[PDB]
Amino acid sequence: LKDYALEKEKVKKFLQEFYQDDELGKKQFKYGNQLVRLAHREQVALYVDLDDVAEDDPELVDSICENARRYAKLFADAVQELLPQYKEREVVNKDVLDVYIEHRLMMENQYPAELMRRFELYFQGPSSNKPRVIREVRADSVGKLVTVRGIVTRVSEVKPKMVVATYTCDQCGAETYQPIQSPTFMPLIMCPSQECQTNRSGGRLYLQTRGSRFIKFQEMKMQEHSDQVPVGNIPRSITVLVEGENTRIAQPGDHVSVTGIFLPILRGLLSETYLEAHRIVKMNKSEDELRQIAEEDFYEKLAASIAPEIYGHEDVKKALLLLLVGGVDQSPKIRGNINICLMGDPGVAKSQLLSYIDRLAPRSQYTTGRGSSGVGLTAAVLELTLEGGALVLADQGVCCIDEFDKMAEADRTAIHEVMEQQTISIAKAGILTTLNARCSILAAANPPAALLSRFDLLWLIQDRPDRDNDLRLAQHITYVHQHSRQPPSQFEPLDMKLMRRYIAMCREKQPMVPESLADYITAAYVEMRREAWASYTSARTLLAILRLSTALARLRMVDVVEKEDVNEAIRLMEMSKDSLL
Amino acid sequence: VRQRPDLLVIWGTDVNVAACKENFQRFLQRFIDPLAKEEENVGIDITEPLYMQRLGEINVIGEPFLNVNCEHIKSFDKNLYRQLISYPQEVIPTFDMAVNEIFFDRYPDSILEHQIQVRPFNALKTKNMRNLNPEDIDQLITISGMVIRTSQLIPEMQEAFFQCQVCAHTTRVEMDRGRIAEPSVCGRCHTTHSMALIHNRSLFSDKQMIKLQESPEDMPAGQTPHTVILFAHNDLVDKVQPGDRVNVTGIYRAVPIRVNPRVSNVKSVYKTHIDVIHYRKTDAKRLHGLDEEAEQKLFSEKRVELLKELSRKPDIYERLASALAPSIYEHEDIKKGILLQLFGGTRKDFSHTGRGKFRAEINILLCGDPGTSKSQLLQYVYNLVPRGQYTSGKGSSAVGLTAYVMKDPETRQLVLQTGALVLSDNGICCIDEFDKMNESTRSVLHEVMEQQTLSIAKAGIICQLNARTSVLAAANPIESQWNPKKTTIENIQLPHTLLSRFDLIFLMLDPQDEAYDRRLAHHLVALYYQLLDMAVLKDYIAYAHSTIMPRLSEEASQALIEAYVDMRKIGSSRGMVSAYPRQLESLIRLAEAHAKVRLSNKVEAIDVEEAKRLHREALKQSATDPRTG
DNA sequence: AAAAAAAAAAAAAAAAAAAAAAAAA
DNA sequence: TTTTTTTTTTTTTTTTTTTTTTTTT
Numbered sequence A: 001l002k003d004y005a006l007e008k009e010k011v012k013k014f015l016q017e018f019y020q021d022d023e024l025g026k027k028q029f030k031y032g033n034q035l036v037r038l039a040h041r042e043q044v045a046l047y048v049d050l051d052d053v054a055e056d057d058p059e060l061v062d063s064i065c066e067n068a069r070r071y072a073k074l075f076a077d078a079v080q081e082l083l084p085q086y087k088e089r090e091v092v093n094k095d096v097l098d099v100y101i102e103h104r105l106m107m108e109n110q111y112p113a114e115l116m117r118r119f120e121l122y123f124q125g126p127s128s129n130k131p132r133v134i135r136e137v138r139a140d141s142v143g144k145l146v147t148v149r150g151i152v153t154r155v156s157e158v159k160p161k162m163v164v165a166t167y168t169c170d171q172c173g174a175e176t177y178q179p180i181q182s183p184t185f186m187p188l189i190m191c192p193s194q195e196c197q198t199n200r201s202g203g204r205l206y207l208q209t210r211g212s213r214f215i216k217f218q219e220m221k222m223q224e225h226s227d228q229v230p231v232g233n234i235p236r237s238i239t240v241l242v243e244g245e246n247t248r249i250a251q252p253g254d255h256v257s258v259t260g261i262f263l264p265i266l267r268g269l270l271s272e273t274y275l276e277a278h279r280i281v282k283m284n285k286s287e288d289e290l291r292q293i294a295e296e297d298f299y300e301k302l303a304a305s306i307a308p309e310i311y312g313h314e315d316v317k318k319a320l321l322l323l324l325v326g327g328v329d330q331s332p333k334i335r336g337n338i339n340i341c342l343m344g345d346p347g348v349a350k351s352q353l354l355s356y357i358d359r360l361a362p363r364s365q366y367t368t369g370r371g372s373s374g375v376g377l378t379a380a381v382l383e384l385t386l387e388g389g390a391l392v393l394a395d396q397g398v399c400c401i402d403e404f405d406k407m408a409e410a411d412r413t414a415i416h417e418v419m420e421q422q423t424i425s426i427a428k429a430g431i432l433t434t435l436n437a438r439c440s441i442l443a444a445a446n447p448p449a450a451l452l453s454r455f456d457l458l459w460l461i462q463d464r465p466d467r468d469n470d471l472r473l474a475q476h477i478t479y480v481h482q483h484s485r486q487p488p489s490q491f492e493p494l495d496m497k498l499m500r501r502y503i504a505m506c507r508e509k510q511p512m513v514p515e516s517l518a519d520y521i522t523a524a525y526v527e528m529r530r531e532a533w534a535s536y537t538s539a540r541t542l543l544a545i546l547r548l549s550t551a552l553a554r555l556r557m558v559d560v561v562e563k564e565d566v567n568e569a570i571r572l573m574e575m576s577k578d579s580l581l
Numbered sequence B: 001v002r003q004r005p006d007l008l009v010i011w012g013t014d015v016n017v018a019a020c021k022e023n024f025q026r027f028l029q030r031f032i033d034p035l036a037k038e039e040e041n042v043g044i045d046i047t048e049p050l051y052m053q054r055l056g057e058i059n060v061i062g063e064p065f066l067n068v069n070c071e072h073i074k075s076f077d078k079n080l081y082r083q084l085i086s087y088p089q090e091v092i093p094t095f096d097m098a099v100n101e102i103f104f105d106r107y108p109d110s111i112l113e114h115q116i117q118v119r120p121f122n123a124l125k126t127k128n129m130r131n132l133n134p135e136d137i138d139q140l141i142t143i144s145g146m147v148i149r150t151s152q153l154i155p156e157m158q159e160a161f162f163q164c165q166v167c168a169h170t171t172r173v174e175m176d177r178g179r180i181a182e183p184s185v186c187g188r189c190h191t192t193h194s195m196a197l198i199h200n201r202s203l204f205s206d207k208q209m210i211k212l213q214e215s216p217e218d219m220p221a222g223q224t225p226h227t228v229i230l231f232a233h234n235d236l237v238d239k240v241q242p243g244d245r246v247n248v249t250g251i252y253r254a255v256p257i258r259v260n261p262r263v264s265n266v267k268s269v270y271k272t273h274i275d276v277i278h279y280r281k282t283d284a285k286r287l288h289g290l291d292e293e294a295e296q297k298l299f300s301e302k303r304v305e306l307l308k309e310l311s312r313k314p315d316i317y318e319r320l321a322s323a324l325a326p327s328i329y330e331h332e333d334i335k336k337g338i339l340l341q342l343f344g345g346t347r348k349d350f351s352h353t354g355r356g357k358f359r360a361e362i363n364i365l366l367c368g369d370p371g372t373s374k375s376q377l378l379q380y381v382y383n384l385v386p387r388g389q390y391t392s393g394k395g396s397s398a399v400g401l402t403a404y405v406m407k408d409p410e411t412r413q414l415v416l417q418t419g420a421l422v423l424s425d426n427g428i429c430c431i432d433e434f435d436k437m438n439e440s441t442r443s444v445l446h447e448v449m450e451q452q453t454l455s456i457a458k459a460g461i462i463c464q465l466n467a468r469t470s471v472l473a474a475a476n477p478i479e480s481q482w483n484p485k486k487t488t489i490e491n492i493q494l495p496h497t498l499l500s501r502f503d504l505i506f507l508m509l510d511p512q513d514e515a516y517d518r519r520l521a522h523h524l525v526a527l528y529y530q531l532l533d534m535a536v537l538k539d540y541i542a543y544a545h546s547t548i549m550p551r552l553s554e555e556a557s558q559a560l561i562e563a564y565v566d567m568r569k570i571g572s573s574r575g576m577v578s579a580y581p582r583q584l585e586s587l588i589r590l591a592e593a594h595a596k597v598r599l600s601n602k603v604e605a606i607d608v609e610e611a612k613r614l615h616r617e618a619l620k621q622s623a624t625d626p627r628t629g
Numbered sequence C: 001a002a003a004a005a006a007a008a009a010a011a012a013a014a015a016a017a018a019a020a021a022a023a024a025a
Numbered sequence D: 001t002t003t004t005t006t007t008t009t010t011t012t013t014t015t016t017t018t019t020t021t022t023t024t025t
C-alpha cells in the first residue's frame, strides 16, 4: 500500500526544486546548494527541515512523522543518488576515509551504501508537532519523529562506533563488508570472496580498522523540566544516543530540545527504548538595537531590569550585574570573576535575586543548604567515569549558593579553593584529580573575617522599618499580585532573552587599565586601606577595585577603562562597606 | 631485527615505500636546523647535519634508537610529514629501513643487538584528546599528561615454538597479523595434530599498561579531567614512574572489546588507547627531572662555565630568589626559603649508622591570613617543579593521600594505587589550607615528614612505600585573622609536634605600612596592564642537584652547635615556638641548601649563618619578645 | 562553638545457587 | 541430535570508605 520508489521520486523532487528568499530577497534553491556543498565534502550533515517539506507536501510530512527510519533511509539514498549530478569539481581528499573511498570506487557483492556516504541527514521536527513530555512518550510513539525537552543530566564521552566493518582476506585480496545495526555483531571468520569460494581456501580473513567505517557516538540521559513533572511524581529520565555531527553539542546541565526517533533496542519480546538524536537545540539560558546600548544610562537599565518585581535594592542589582559580566582574566594567573555575598535579615528578597540569576545567567547552578552538599558541589567517580557537581556544571558560570552560612563545613572549605584557586583538588580514596571550576560564586546567608576576607563584595541588607518606605514597597508588592507584572515605570524592563544577548555581547570586550589611572587607583586604594585601619582592607580590595572597574568598562564596551568606572566601582565598595555600618 | 608491537600506494593510501624511503634518507643526510641554539642541542656539531651526528652518537654508545623530531620533517618536507602522521604503520618501517641503510653504508662494521628503529616525536600536539575523532584513528599523535599508574610487565608472544608429541620435531612459527598459525600437521613424521605449542621455549616481548592523566591546555567549560590507557612495547616499559609528567607520542589505536571476556561477540562501540612510540620528559615551563640530571651529557661545557661564573657573583642567592614568581612582590625571605627548598639538602646514607633514613628535603609552612598571597606561591611551585602535587585540606583523606585498592576496570583485578603524597615522591607536595584538615589525615604527614616512608598494613598488602616528598604547606590563623592579641603558637593553631617537623614557618603578616601599600598597588596595577630567565635558573638547579654534594666543615659544625644552643635559649619562652633537637637538623639542611646555591661543595660559616638568619627572620623572632604577641 | 569519636549510609566486591543457551562431537 | 560447559541473573551477604551524627571541652 505504501510504495517507496514514488517516495524516492517525491523526496528527490523536493530536494532539487525547493527554494527560499532568506538572504535579502534572493531565491537560492535552499537544498540544491546544500547538496553541492555535500558533494564537495565541505559539509557532513544535511538537516531536512520538515517545515519546508510540509510547505508543499503535508501528506509526505505526515507519513514521515508517522514512520521515521524508513523515510530517513529514503532521504539518505535519494541524496546519494543526487550527489553525482551536483558535484562540480574534484575534492582535495579531506580525510583518509575519503582516500579509501576513492580507491575502492576506482578498483570497482556490492559496496554497502553506508560505507560510501560520508554525509549524514537529520529531520527538524515540524512546527505543527508540539514538543512532547518525556513521560508521555510511550509505545504508541515507537519509531515516530518526536521532539522532547529536558535537562541533560549526564552525557557519556565521544567514542567511535563502527557502522560498516571491513575485513581483508589473506588469500584473495578482496574486502568483506558488514553493516552494523545490532549493538553487537559476530565478526566474520571466513572470507566469502568469490575467488576463494571457487578456490575453496581457508578464507580466514582479518578485520581491518583502516577500511572500516567509524562514527562519533555519545550516550546521554535527559530529565524532565520541574515545570512538567506530575504533582506527586519525580522527573523522568530518557536515554539519547547522539552520533555523527550531533556529538559534543550538549554538556551536562544544558536545557535541550531534542528531535529524534523513539526506537527500541532488542533484548514476550520486551524491549528497552531510547531516542536516536537527529536535531539538538539548546534552549533558555543554554540558548546559543545599538542605539540603546550606546546610551549613558544603559548601565542603569540592565541593573533596573534585574528582577524588577524586587523593589529597591538599586545598588545591589548594579553589583550583581557586574558579577554576570565579570572582570577580565589576566595571565602575566589572576581570576576575573566577581564574588558577591548577599547577607541580610529574613525576608529581604535575598533568595529571589539568587533564583533570578539562575534563570538569567548562561551557565548557573542554584544549590540550597544541605540538600545538594558534598559531592553535589565537587565531583565524584561513577568503566569508572568522573561526574562533576554544581561547581563543575557551573564552571565558567554563576553558582548561586543560598544559605552559605549553614553549609557543611567541608563544602565551605571546598568553596574557599574555588573563589581563590578556581579549582577543586580532590585526593579521596577513589578520586585523585584537579577539576577546573572557574565559576563566580553568588552566596546568600544570614547573620566574619573567615568570610569577609574572601568575597570581593559583602553586601549587607537590613529591612529596617519605616512608615513611608514600607508603604511604597507594599504598593509595589500588592501590584505584582494584582497584575503579575512589576509596576510600570519610565522605562520598560529588558526581557531575559534580550538581556542574555547584551551581557554576552559585553563578555568578549577585554579592556585595559591605562597607566594614567594607576596613580588614581593607587591613591584610591591607600585611602581604603586606612579606613578599616582607623575604624578589613588588604591587597584583595585593590583587586576587587580592578575587577569591578573592568566590569563597568565592558558594560560601556570601551576597551580602555575610564576614571568614571573606578569611581563607580569604588562607589559600590562604599555602599557595600557602608551596609555593614 | 626486533619486531615492534607498537606498529604505487600499498592499499588505499598515498604512500609508496620507495618514495618515503628516499625522502627520509635525504632528510637525514642534508637537514640543518637554522634557528638551532647551541644550548638547545648539546654536544652536537651544529654546522654539520644533525641526525648524522645522532647516528654517530648511536655508534658510540650503542643505543639503537633515533629520536627524530617530527617538526624537523614538517619543516624539511610537509608531504612526508603528512604521510608519516596519516600512516604511522607503513611509514615507520620505511624510516627504519632508511636509517639502517644510512648507518650501515657509513660505519659498515658497527655492532648492534638489532636494527635501528626511528621514534617520531613532538608531533602536532593534540590539545585535548576529546577533540579527537574516529577520523583520527590509527594515526600518530602527541599528548601531554601525568602518569597515574603503571602496570607490571605483560609478556606477549612473537614466535611460537612447537614440538611434535611423537617425534619431537621443533619449528618456530612467527606472528602473522596478531595470530599464530598452528601447524596442525607435523612436518617431520607427518602425524596429524601432533604439534603442540611450547610456551617457555617460545619468544616473547614486553607490554606495559600505563594509566595516564592528561592535562589538556584546551579545557572547555564543565569538562572533567580525562584518563587514558597507553601501551609501552619492548623498550619503553618502566620508562615512566607514577607522578612523572610526560609527553607521549604514539599511535591512536581503537580495538574491539568482547561483550564478555569469554564470548567472541564484540560491542559495536570500540574503546581507544595509545601505543607509545616516544616519551619526552623535557619541559621548558618546569625544572629538570631526576632522570635528566642523572644522564651526564646535558650541560655543554660553555653552559657549565656560565653556571660556574654565575655562582661566583656575590648576589647569586638574591638573584636566584628574585627569579621565583616575578609577579609576587618583595617576598625576598619567602622566595629565599623556597629556593633553599628547591635545592634541598644533601642526601646521606645512614644504613651503616644503624639510624635509618634521614630526611634531606625541606618543609615550609606559610602561616598567614587569607588575604595575603599565600596560595599563589603554592600554586606557582606546584606549576614549577616536576613530580609536584597539590591538595586543599578538606578535599583529601588519609587513604587517598597514602594508598588505596581498586579493581582495575580493564583487567578486573584488585590492585593497589598510590596516593597524592606518594606521587610526589621526589618532588613537592603543596598542601593548601593546611589548618582546615582533620587530624586523621594530618597524622599521616608525621611519618612522611620525618622518616620519608609510609608503612601501610592493610588486608591487601603490608608494605612501606618510600615518599621523599617536601611539604609546602599553607595555613590560615585561627579566626582567619592574625589578631596581634594572641601569641604566635596560639595563633597558628597547630600541634607543637607537627610545627616541630617544619623547618621554616614563615609568618605572612600585613604591616600597616603606607609605602609598602603604595609599592604593592603599583606592582599589581602594572601586572594588570604589563630578571634571570627560566632557561638559566632551571639549568643552575639541575647542575647543583647533579654535582654539588656539600659536606660539613669544622667551623660550620661549631657555628651550628652554638646556633642550636642559642635557639634553645631563645625559644624557651612560653608563647614562642619552642626549639627542639629536630630544629638543629633543620639548620643543617638549610645550611647545606645554601651551600648548594653557591656550588661550594662544602658548608662553612657563611652558609650556617645564612641558615640561622633565615630561620630567625621566619617566626619574626626579632620582632617578637619574651612577652609573646 | 568547635573538635573527637562513633554510627550509619552507601557503594563496591565476593559467594553461590540455579536456570538457560552455545559449542562440540 | 544430544550432551556439556559455560553464561548469566538473580539474591544475598560482606567489607571498605566516606559521610553523617553524637558527645565532650
Ligand SMILES: Nc1ncnc2c1ncn2[C@@H]1O[C@H](COP(=O)(O)OP(=O)(O)O)[C@@H](O)[C@H]1O
Residues within 6 Å of the ligand: A309, A310, A311, A312, A313, A344, A345, A346, A347, A348, A349, A350, A351, A352, A353, A477
Ligand atoms: N524588596 C523586595 N521587593 C519585593 N519583594 C520582596 C522584597 N523583599 C522580600 N520580598 C518578598 O519576600 C518573599 C520571600 O523572600 P526571600 O527571598 O525568601 O527572602 P530572603 O531569602 O531574603 O529571606 C518573596 O516572595 C518576595 O516577593
Ligand SMILES: [Mg+2]
Residues within 6 Å of the ligand: A350, A351
Ligand atoms: Mg533566604
Ligand SMILES: [Zn+2]
Residues within 6 Å of the ligand: A169, A170, A171, A172, A173, A174, A191, A193, A195, A196, A203
Ligand atoms: Zn579470500
Ligand SMILES: [Zn+2]
Residues within 6 Å of the ligand: B164, B165, B166, B167, B168, B169, B186, B187, B188, B189, B190, B191, B194
Ligand atoms: Zn612428528
